[PDB]
Amino acid sequence: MTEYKLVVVGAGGVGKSALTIQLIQNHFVDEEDSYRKQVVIDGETCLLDILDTAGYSAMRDQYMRTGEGFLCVFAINNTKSFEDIHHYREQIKRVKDSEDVPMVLVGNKSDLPSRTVDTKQAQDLARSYGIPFIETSAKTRQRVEDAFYTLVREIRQYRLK
Ligand SMILES: N[C@H]1CC[C@@H](N2CCCCCN3/C(=N/S(=O)(=O)c4cnc(N5CCNCC5)c(c4)C2=O)Sc2c(Cl)ccc(O)c23)CC1
Ligand SMILES: Nc1nc2c(ncn2[C@@H]2O[C@H](COP(=O)(O)OP(=O)(O)NP(=O)(O)O)[C@@H](O)[C@H]2O)c(=O)[nH]1
Ligand SMILES: [Co+2]
Ligand SMILES: [Co+2]
Ligand SMILES: [Mg+2]
Numbered sequence: 001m002t003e004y005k006l007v008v009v010g011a012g013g014v015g016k017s018a019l020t021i022q023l024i025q026n027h028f029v030d031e032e033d034s035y036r037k038q039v040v041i042d043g044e045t046c047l048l049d050i051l052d053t054a055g056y057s058a059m060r061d062q063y064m065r066t067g068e069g070f071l072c073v074f075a076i077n078n079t080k081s082f083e084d085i086h087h088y089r090e091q092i093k094r095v096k097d098s099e100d101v102p103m104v105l106v107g108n109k110s111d112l113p114s115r116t117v118d119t120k121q122a123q124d125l126a127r128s129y130g131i132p133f134i135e136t137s138a139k140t141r142q143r144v145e146d147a148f149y150t151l152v153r154e155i156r157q158y159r160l161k
Contacts, residue, residue, distance in 0.1 A: 074108070
């Protein structure tokens with residue numbers, strides 16, 4: 001049965017853990033580990049192996065080398081987290097020595113009114129990076145499945161390249 005190593009990266013407090021737990025338990029966390037889940041996507045069965053990282057170059061480099069797909073998460077109310085997406089993507093590409101790595105840009109906290117990053121701005125960036133963009137709320141569970149499953153789909157597209 002096919003396994004996919006997924007890695008959730010992004011600045012402190014963007015909601016990496018809340019997103020991962022929302023997929024695993026369907027519950028929103030309140031006041032660093034790996035998770036497993038078997039899912040059917042497009043009629044193929046697979047095992048999702050997800051590493052929830054925190055916002056040591058050797059440890060970092062190991063997960064970026066091991067990871068097959070990366071959810072690059074920013075929060076729509078934190079411009080710095082959005083700007084730092086450059087940094088995560090650059091580090092991944094350097095480690096994997098490839099311009100093409102399955103990735104999905106996720107703008108989390110879509111339920112918040114204090115928005116500092118416009119959907120259009122993140123869409124344009126993702127288009128520049130050649131990766132899907134999805135806005136999520138870990139709070140409401142809006143597009144959480146969508147983000148992880150789009151990522152798996154990207155890994156499969158890549159594997160057929
Ligand atoms: N939960 C405790 C035991 C596992 C610890 N841990 C994180 C879980 C590692 C799970 C296996 N793994 C990996 N193992 S690892 O390369 O040796 C590794 C990478 N980062 C880890 N951490 C903890 C340190 N800070 C970064 C995340 C740990 C292990 C690392 O020492 S990589 C990896 C990827 Cl890319 C996807 C899915 C994975 O399951 C995966 C966390 C403390
Ligand atoms: N309103 C709202 N709050 C969220 C959302 N996702 C996470 N949060 C909140 O954001 C804060 C940080 O969430 P957490 O999941 O721990 O983020 P993290 O990115 O995993 N943090 P770290 O880098 O330290 O590991 C918490 O208060 C959490 O409840 C969301 O979609 N909406
Ligand atoms: Co609870
Ligand atoms: Co740079
Ligand atoms: Mg966390």
